[PDB]
Design an enzyme around this catalytic site. Sequence first.
Site, PDB file in Angstrom:
ATOM      1  N   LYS A  11      -4.324  -0.822   4.815  1.00 20.42           N
ATOM      2  CA  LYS A  11      -5.723  -1.209   5.046  1.00 20.42           C
ATOM      3  C   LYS A  11      -5.982  -2.663   4.651  1.00 20.42           C
ATOM      4  CE  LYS A  11      -7.562   3.309   3.938  1.00 20.42           C
ATOM      5  NZ  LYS A  11      -8.811   4.133   3.898  1.00 20.42           N
ATOM      6  N   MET A  12      -6.660  -3.436   5.492  1.00 24.35           N
ATOM      7  CA  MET A  12      -6.895  -4.865   5.260  1.00 24.35           C
ATOM      8  C   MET A  12      -8.383  -5.142   5.096  1.00 24.35           C
ATOM      9  SD  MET A  12      -5.567  -7.929   7.729  1.00 24.35           S
ATOM     10  CE  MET A  12      -5.756  -9.667   7.438  1.00 24.35           C
ATOM     11  N   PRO A  13      -8.815  -5.802   4.031  1.00 24.31           N
ATOM     12  CA  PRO A  13     -10.246  -6.145   3.940  1.00 24.31           C
ATOM     13  C   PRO A  13     -10.713  -7.059   5.062  1.00 24.31           C
ATOM     14  CG  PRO A  13      -9.228  -6.267   1.824  1.00 24.31           C
ATOM     15  CD  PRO A  13      -8.100  -6.260   2.844  1.00 24.31           C
ATOM     16  N   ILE A  14     -11.842  -6.680   5.665  1.00 21.53           N
ATOM     17  CA  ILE A  14     -12.269  -7.423   6.862  1.00 21.53           C
ATOM     18  C   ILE A  14     -12.875  -8.774   6.485  1.00 21.53           C
ATOM     19  CG2 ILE A  14     -12.483  -5.326   8.175  1.00 21.53           C
ATOM     20  CD1 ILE A  14     -15.540  -5.684   8.072  1.00 21.53           C
ATOM     21  N   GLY A  16     -12.252 -12.059   4.026  1.00 24.59           N
ATOM     22  CA  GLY A  16     -11.434 -12.811   3.133  1.00 24.59           C
ATOM     23  C   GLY A  16     -11.929 -14.198   2.846  1.00 24.59           C
ATOM     24  N   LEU A  17     -11.357 -14.821   1.825  1.00 22.42           N
ATOM     25  CA  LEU A  17     -11.656 -16.212   1.506  1.00 22.42           C
ATOM     26  C   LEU A  17     -10.598 -17.135   2.067  1.00 22.42           C
ATOM     27  CD1 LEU A  17     -13.414 -18.121  -0.291  1.00 22.42           C
ATOM     28  CD2 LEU A  17     -11.585 -17.861  -2.025  1.00 22.42           C
ATOM     29  N   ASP A  43      -6.797 -15.812   2.102  1.00 19.38           N
ATOM     30  CA  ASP A  43      -5.930 -16.377   3.134  1.00 19.38           C
ATOM     31  C   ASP A  43      -5.376 -17.708   2.615  1.00 19.38           C
ATOM     32  OD1 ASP A  43      -5.115 -16.331   6.092  1.00 19.38           O
ATOM     33  OD2 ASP A  43      -5.829 -18.365   5.808  1.00 19.38           O
ATOM     34  N   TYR A  48      -1.086 -25.784   3.097  1.00 19.06           N
ATOM     35  CA  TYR A  48      -2.345 -26.206   2.490  1.00 19.06           C
ATOM     36  C   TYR A  48      -2.138 -26.913   1.158  1.00 19.06           C
ATOM     37  CZ  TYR A  48      -4.248 -22.669   5.756  1.00 19.06           C
ATOM     38  OH  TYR A  48      -4.536 -21.912   6.878  1.00 19.06           O
ATOM     39  N   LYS A  77       1.544 -17.820   5.177  1.00 21.84           N
ATOM     40  CA  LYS A  77       2.023 -18.224   6.485  1.00 21.84           C
ATOM     41  C   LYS A  77       3.255 -19.135   6.341  1.00 21.84           C
ATOM     42  CE  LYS A  77      -2.874 -18.512   7.785  1.00 21.84           C
ATOM     43  NZ  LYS A  77      -3.457 -19.230   6.597  1.00 21.84           N
ATOM     44  N   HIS A 110       2.820 -19.196  11.274  1.00 22.72           N
ATOM     45  CA  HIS A 110       1.596 -19.996  11.315  1.00 22.72           C
ATOM     46  C   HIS A 110       1.297 -20.552  12.702  1.00 22.72           C
ATOM     47  CE1 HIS A 110      -0.898 -22.639   8.308  1.00 22.72           C
ATOM     48  NE2 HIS A 110      -1.622 -22.470   9.409  1.00 22.72           N
TER      49      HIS A 110
HETATM   50  N1  LIG Z   1      -4.013 -19.973  11.047  1.00 20.19           N
HETATM   51  C1  LIG Z   1      -4.421 -21.212  11.238  1.00 20.19           C
HETATM   52  O1  LIG Z   1      -3.970 -21.998  12.061  1.00 20.19           O
HETATM   53  C2  LIG Z   1      -5.760 -21.565  10.607  1.00 20.19           C
HETATM   54  C3  LIG Z   1      -6.468 -22.683  11.142  1.00 20.19           C
HETATM   55  C4  LIG Z   1      -7.712 -23.043  10.542  1.00 20.19           C
HETATM   56  C5  LIG Z   1      -8.222 -22.252   9.491  1.00 20.19           C
HETATM   57  N2  LIG Z   1      -7.452 -21.165   9.027  1.00 20.19           N
HETATM   58  C6  LIG Z   1      -7.924 -20.385   7.807  1.00 20.19           C
HETATM   59  O2  LIG Z   1      -9.310 -20.089   8.115  1.00 20.19           O
HETATM   60  C7  LIG Z   1     -10.138 -20.545   6.993  1.00 20.19           C
HETATM   61  C8  LIG Z   1     -11.576 -20.782   7.413  1.00 20.19           C
HETATM   62  O3  LIG Z   1     -11.538 -21.880   8.390  1.00 20.19           O
HETATM   63  P1  LIG Z   1     -11.913 -23.388   8.034  1.00 20.19           P
HETATM   64  O4  LIG Z   1     -11.537 -23.755   6.653  1.00 20.19           O
HETATM   65  O5  LIG Z   1     -11.379 -24.218   9.138  1.00 20.19           O
HETATM   66  O6  LIG Z   1     -13.512 -23.480   8.155  1.00 20.19           O
HETATM   67  P2  LIG Z   1     -14.819 -22.530   8.052  1.00 20.19           P
HETATM   68  O7  LIG Z   1     -14.539 -21.443   7.111  1.00 20.19           O
HETATM   69  O8  LIG Z   1     -15.260 -22.264   9.407  1.00 20.19           O
HETATM   70  O9  LIG Z   1     -15.869 -23.593   7.427  1.00 20.19           O
HETATM   71  C9  LIG Z   1     -15.637 -24.071   6.089  1.00 20.19           C
HETATM   72  C10 LIG Z   1     -16.723 -25.158   5.827  1.00 20.19           C
HETATM   73  O10 LIG Z   1     -18.013 -24.482   5.757  1.00 20.19           O
HETATM   74  C11 LIG Z   1     -18.680 -24.711   4.557  1.00 20.19           C
HETATM   75  N3  LIG Z   1     -19.406 -23.536   4.234  1.00 20.19           N
HETATM   76  C12 LIG Z   1     -18.898 -22.332   3.782  1.00 20.19           C
HETATM   77  N4  LIG Z   1     -19.791 -21.427   3.564  1.00 20.19           N
HETATM   78  C13 LIG Z   1     -20.973 -22.074   3.888  1.00 20.19           C
HETATM   79  C14 LIG Z   1     -22.257 -21.545   3.840  1.00 20.19           C
HETATM   80  N5  LIG Z   1     -22.617 -20.337   3.477  1.00 20.19           N
HETATM   81  N6  LIG Z   1     -23.231 -22.460   4.238  1.00 20.19           N
HETATM   82  C15 LIG Z   1     -22.964 -23.747   4.649  1.00 20.19           C
HETATM   83  N7  LIG Z   1     -21.692 -24.250   4.697  1.00 20.19           N
HETATM   84  C16 LIG Z   1     -20.720 -23.353   4.302  1.00 20.19           C
HETATM   85  C17 LIG Z   1     -17.596 -25.050   3.581  1.00 20.19           C
HETATM   86  O11 LIG Z   1     -18.084 -25.908   2.541  1.00 20.19           O
HETATM   87  P3  LIG Z   1     -17.664 -25.816   0.989  1.00 20.19           P
HETATM   88  O12 LIG Z   1     -16.259 -25.396   0.938  1.00 20.19           O
HETATM   89  O13 LIG Z   1     -17.983 -27.242   0.450  1.00 20.19           O
HETATM   90  O14 LIG Z   1     -18.656 -24.819   0.288  1.00 20.19           O
HETATM   91  C18 LIG Z   1     -16.594 -25.890   4.446  1.00 20.19           C
HETATM   92  O15 LIG Z   1     -17.111 -27.210   4.617  1.00 20.19           O
HETATM   93  C19 LIG Z   1      -9.284 -21.729   6.445  1.00 20.19           C
HETATM   94  O16 LIG Z   1      -9.738 -22.219   5.204  1.00 20.19           O
HETATM   95  C20 LIG Z   1      -7.890 -21.141   6.496  1.00 20.19           C
HETATM   96  O17 LIG Z   1      -7.758 -20.178   5.420  1.00 20.19           O
HETATM   97  C21 LIG Z   1      -6.231 -20.792   9.559  1.00 20.19           C
HETATM   98  N1  LIG Z   2      -4.251 -29.764  13.596  1.00 28.13           N
HETATM   99  C1  LIG Z   2      -4.280 -28.421  13.580  1.00 28.13           C
HETATM  100  O1  LIG Z   2      -4.640 -27.688  14.497  1.00 28.13           O
HETATM  101  C2  LIG Z   2      -3.782 -27.768  12.296  1.00 28.13           C
HETATM  102  C3  LIG Z   2      -4.873 -26.961  11.602  1.00 28.13           C
HETATM  103  C4  LIG Z   2      -4.386 -26.460  10.246  1.00 28.13           C
HETATM  104  N2  LIG Z   2      -5.401 -25.800   9.414  1.00 28.13           N
HETATM  105  C5  LIG Z   2      -4.972 -24.564   9.044  1.00 28.13           C
HETATM  106  O2  LIG Z   2      -5.626 -23.774   8.387  1.00 28.13           O
HETATM  107  N3  LIG Z   2      -3.759 -24.246   9.627  1.00 28.13           N
HETATM  108  C6  LIG Z   2      -3.335 -25.332  10.334  1.00 28.13           C
HETATM  109  O3  LIG Z   2      -2.285 -25.416  10.956  1.00 28.13           O
HETATM  110  C7  LIG Z   2      -3.694 -27.551   9.438  1.00 28.13           C
HETATM  111  C8  LIG Z   2      -3.554 -27.432   8.067  1.00 28.13           C
HETATM  112  C9  LIG Z   2      -2.911 -28.463   7.404  1.00 28.13           C
HETATM  113  F1  LIG Z   2      -2.788 -28.302   6.038  1.00 28.13           F
HETATM  114  C10 LIG Z   2      -2.432 -29.543   8.008  1.00 28.13           C
HETATM  115  C11 LIG Z   2      -2.571 -29.674   9.392  1.00 28.13           C
HETATM  116  C12 LIG Z   2      -3.209 -28.674  10.113  1.00 28.13           C
HETATM  117  O4  LIG Z   2      -3.328 -28.827  11.461  1.00 28.13           O
END
Ligand SMILES: NC(=O)c1ccc[n+]([C@@H]2O[C@H](COP(=O)([O-])OP(=O)(O)OC[C@H]3O[C@@H](n4cnc5c(N)ncnc54)[C@H](OP(=O)(O)O)[C@@H]3O)[C@@H](O)[C@H]2O)c1
Ligand SMILES: NC(=O)[C@@H]1C[C@]2(NC(=O)NC2=O)c2cc(F)ccc2O1
EC number: 1.1.1.21
Length: 315
Positions: A11-14, A16-17, A43, A48, A77, A110
């Site tokens: 089971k996965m929490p829907i 996450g941070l 996450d 990162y 990842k 990733h």
């Molecule tokens: N698999 C991948 O390729 C991939 C790619 C991108 C992201 N991710 C994961 O997804 C996560 C979430 O995506 P993300 O970091 O791109 O951006 P996001 O969660 O869409 O947005 C984060 C931004 O929103 C602000 N924020 C958060 N809660 C808020 C609220 N209640 N009101 C107003 N602003 C708020 C945060 O500010 P503060 O932090 O200053 O409060 C930060 O500036 C990542 O951190 C990472 O774990 C994975």
């Molecule tokens: N340019 C992109 O699309 C991706 C986004 C992305 N953020 C994230 O959470 N996964 C990613 O791979 C990321 C994170 C990094 F730490 C550095 C580069 C980077 O690039």
Amino acid sequence: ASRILLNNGAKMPILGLGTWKSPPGQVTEAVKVAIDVGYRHIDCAHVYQNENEVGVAIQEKLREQVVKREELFIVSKLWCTYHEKGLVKGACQKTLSDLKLDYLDLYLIHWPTGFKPGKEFFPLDESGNVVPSDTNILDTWAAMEELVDEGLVKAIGISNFNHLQVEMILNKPGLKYKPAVNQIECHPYLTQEKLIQYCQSKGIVVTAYSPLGSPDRPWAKPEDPSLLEDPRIKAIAAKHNKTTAQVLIRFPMQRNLVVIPKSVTPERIAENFKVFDFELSSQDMTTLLSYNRNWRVCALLSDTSHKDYPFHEEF
Ligand SMILES: NC(=O)c1ccc[n+]([C@@H]2O[C@H](COP(=O)([O-])OP(=O)(O)OC[C@H]3O[C@@H](n4cnc5c(N)ncnc54)[C@H](OP(=O)(O)O)[C@@H]3O)[C@@H](O)[C@H]2O)c1
Ligand SMILES: NC(=O)[C@@H]1C[C@]2(NC(=O)NC2=O)c2cc(F)ccc2O1
């Protein structure tokens, strides 16, 4: 319900941070606050550069008996520079060491793009192009399967895989474990209906990343659309007496997605968790879906030339 069943029977929490861009000096308190208020999914990723500090928080809250390890759902990842068969285990083990865990609940590839191994995360040629790996996603998948069979991870999955790439894994000769999760970008400006329906049709849970539109993304430009400031979304939130961010988080939850908003602000960490007390109507859902514009936060723009680059296909 707060958790979704995966095809591995866990089971996965829907909710996450997220931790991308969380500064190393702020993320330990951020994860401590998040676990204190109720988060049970973090996450992470090696790329990162903050897994050690995340881990400090996890370990303190285990020590303090705020939570049990079985109650946590920790995700990391495999970075692109580690797709080689012989590098996957060490990459997982480095993440485990940094997070001070003995297993991961979920380890994801990733990106489908493999890069030249070495110190640099984005290895470049003299002309500025990213240098690829000749390793293919199916051999990388077998190396992930080994991690399950060694006890290092409970589930394996993929991220930023398009529908043909998911299909390639599903059709892999000798497939031992299906991907449990496909983690992809998803929000009202990139609603992903096709890819989501395909994944769900196969039993793969989808996690929505950048659900708030990543307003802190390094390449943000003032003229880009802003979900948090969209007056149409603000109006749905006002109707429901919730913040705009709370609507943006609840929206994927009601599509049977997992969602992983990032914050290092304690007030926002708590706000973002207070989404299990209200319901968007079907009309609200369809209205929010109508805002799609195929707008991407994360398009890996430095390597659109890769064979395996995922976003040329329509989905
Ligand atoms: N698999 C991948 O390729 C991939 C790619 C991108 C992201 N991710 C994961 O997804 C996560 C979430 O995506 P993300 O970091 O791109 O951006 P996001 O969660 O869409 O947005 C984060 C931004 O929103 C602000 N924020 C958060 N809660 C808020 C609220 N209640 N009101 C107003 N602003 C708020 C945060 O500010 P503060 O932090 O200053 O409060 C930060 O500036 C990542 O951190 C990472 O774990 C994975
Ligand atoms: N340019 C992109 O699309 C991706 C986004 C992305 N953020 C994230 O959470 N996964 C990613 O791979 C990321 C994170 C990094 F730490 C550095 C580069 C980077 O690039």
